[PDB]
């Protein structure tokens, strides 16, 4: 039966919330951070829409982060804990069959109207209708309904989906009266379409001005309802946050070297080692940091991702052969200044990574699926090829050719061809920017040695997003990041239902009954021990199918910034909270 409700100020999918009800602020912030000053940021690519939820066009990241808010705010000094932001509290029955959020009486839109349950209901229905990521994420949430003056209740299709109250705190809340209203031209607004009309939110910043496709100026609102709320103390300090968009990374970095961009996150090991020979780098005007914080408690798979919707990549032997052709040792040494570590798990860098042979509960879970998983899961620990020397490079290429021969492809006149049709084995690697070319060219050169015509096709970010949405590629240089609590998002990465649905993150086109069963077991995991064992079992099965060519990664974010930006003395353990917890030194100096 139902019992007297228990209200919570926070939710956690792992452990207990660090902060008690009534806490004043997060520990890491500077409570006296001054309000003021300009922060100049850069963003790759462009934008052509301010619609924060429609998965169409190109939207600036600052819109959802600075103008809109969610029901709960995730603490960057904890793993999954979230605290009441637009919601004052959360209540749910023990069986997790529903979840109710009580909205804060003080929460207001920038136009002064209250944030209401009607807004939450509209936002929920709209994210599910217009955004494939949230459509999947909330697939087990049947409905949202107003159940009180300030209450929204979400109902679930099945009990014991433990993370649902937590993940429901992550979607932006949009103003129903505004989206169902009329613009200045007298035209009804439409959430189903892109827009360049500056959108209105409940967040700390408003869109003050913009140059479509080129820049956006966000301005801090002194009337932001949540300015003094515990999760916001010492946060949202810059008066103005300008974003300038760049399609050329070198032009973007030149803007940083000129002091026209204040902060730069460097994703290239060679650029980090060589591009900083400029005067401001020598006299303390620019600071460089290698920050591990945002990558702690994060699993990473970065890979060459073949598209299994295409006949050329359907054979596991072909996909395995491509790994034998990739030489990581040479790439790391000759081009990457030895900066990287080879990835060997979809949950690499966490306790969720499978290792060795399956044991205990992990082995038991796989045993109930023995007729449906690769035989290798019980006999063969996953390993990548290693190219310690030139004879080994040739031997690994011989192994690639052997796998291709088993798959029906043979060298004819030093070109790898389909043995029955004569059609050459060829593929295109789609890249989003020329900055990826130097990393990918060695792989192209390696497969060319065994008769494969691989070609790079570099496009711009707008074309890239449009092609990836429709899976219009043979292969991409892809990435999937994971938390320590796998859940409802997993079906967006490897679930069968996402293969033929545009806009999913199932880039390889994986469709497998055993994987689907493991994803279901993760979602409905009764406890942490069962979740960990099931996740390692899923990782082991994914790896044994050789769906991708795992690449590499590092354990720290490389950032450089101008010394007029101030950061908290100690960054939150699991993040940087940039730019929200940072502030202007020009302002502090009056």
């Amino acid at each position: 039966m139902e019992e007297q409700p228990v209200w919570h100020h926070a939710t956690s999918s792992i452990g207990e919330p660090k902060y008690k009800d009534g806490f004043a602020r997060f520990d890491y912030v500077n409570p006296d951070a001054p309000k003021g000053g300009e922060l100049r940021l850069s963003e790759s690519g462009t934008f052509d829409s301010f619609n924060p939820i429609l998965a169409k066009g190109e939207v600036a990241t600052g819109v959802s982060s600075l103008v809109f808010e969610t029901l709960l705010k995730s603490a960057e000094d904890e793993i999954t804990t979230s605290y009441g932001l637009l919601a004052e509290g959360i209540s749910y029955p023990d069986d997790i069959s529903s979840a109710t959020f009580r909205l804060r009486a003080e929460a207001k839109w920038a136009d002064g109207k209250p944030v209401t349950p009607e807004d939450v209901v509209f936002s929920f229905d709209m994210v599910k209708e217009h955004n494939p990521l949230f459509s999947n994420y909330y697939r087990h949430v049947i409905s949202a309904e107003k159940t009180g003056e300030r209450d929204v209740t979400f109902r679930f299709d099945e009990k014991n989906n433990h993370e649902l109250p937590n993940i429901l705190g992550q979607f932006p809340i949009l103003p129903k009266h505004w989206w169902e209203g009329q613009d200045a031209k007298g035209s009804k607004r439409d959430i189903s379409r892109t827009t360049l009309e500056p959108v209105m939110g409940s967040g700390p910043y408003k869109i003050a001005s913009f140059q479509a496709g080129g820049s956006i100026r966000f301005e801090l609102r002194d009337d932001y309802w949540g300015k003094d709320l515990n999760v916001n103390v010492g946060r949202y300090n810059f008066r103005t946050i300008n974003y300038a968009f760049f399609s050329d990374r070198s032009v973007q970095f030149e803007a940083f070297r000129a002091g026209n961009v204040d902060f730069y996150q460097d994703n290239s090991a060679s650029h980090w080692a060589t591009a900083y020979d400029f005067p401001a780098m020598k006299d303390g005007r620019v600071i460089r940091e290698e920050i591990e914080n945002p990558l702690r408690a994060t699993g990473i798979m970065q890979a060459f991702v073949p598209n299994m919707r295409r006949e050329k990549f359907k054979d596991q032997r072909v996909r395995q052969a491509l790994n034998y052709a990739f030489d990581f040792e040479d790439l790391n040494r000759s081009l990457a200044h030895n900066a990287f570590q080879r990835v060997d798990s979809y949950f690499w860098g966490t306790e969720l990574a499978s290792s060795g042979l399956p044991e205990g509960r992990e082995k038991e879970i796989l045993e109930e699926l023995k007729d449906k998983v690769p035989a290798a899961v019980f006999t063969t620990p996953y390993k990548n090829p290693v190219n310690g020397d030139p004879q080994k490079v040739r031997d690994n290429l011989r192994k690639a050719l052997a796998l291709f021969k088993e798959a029906g492809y043979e060298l004819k006149g030093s070109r790898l061809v389909n043995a029955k049709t004569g059609e050459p084995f060829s593929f295109e690697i789609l890249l989003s920017n020329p900055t990826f070319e130097r990393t990918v060219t060695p792989f192209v050169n390696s497969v060319r040695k065994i008769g494969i015509d691989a070609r790079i096709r570099t496009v711009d970010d707008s074309q890239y997003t449009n092609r990836v949405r429709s899976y219009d590629y043979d292969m991409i240089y892809g990435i999937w990041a994971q938390t320590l609590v796998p859940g409802n998002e997993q079906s967006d990465y490897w679930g069968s239902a996402s293969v033929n649905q545009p806009g999913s993150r199932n880039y390889a086109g994986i469709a497998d009954p055993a994987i689907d069963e493991l994803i279901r077991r993760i979602v409905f995991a009764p406890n942490r021990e069962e979740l960990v064992a099931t996740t390692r079992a899923l990782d082991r099965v994914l790896l044994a199918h050789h769906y991708v060519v795992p690449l590499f990664y590092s354990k720290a974010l490389r950032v450089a910034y101008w010394n007029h930006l101030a950061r908290p003395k100690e960054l939150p353990y699991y993040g940087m909270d940039f730019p929200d917890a940072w502030w202007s030194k020009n302002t502090a100096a009056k």
């Binding site: 994703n267 060679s270 990435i479 590499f552």
Partner: peptide, 5 residues
Amino acid sequence: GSDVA
């Protein structure tokens, strides 16, 4: 984001 050489 993606890390490169």
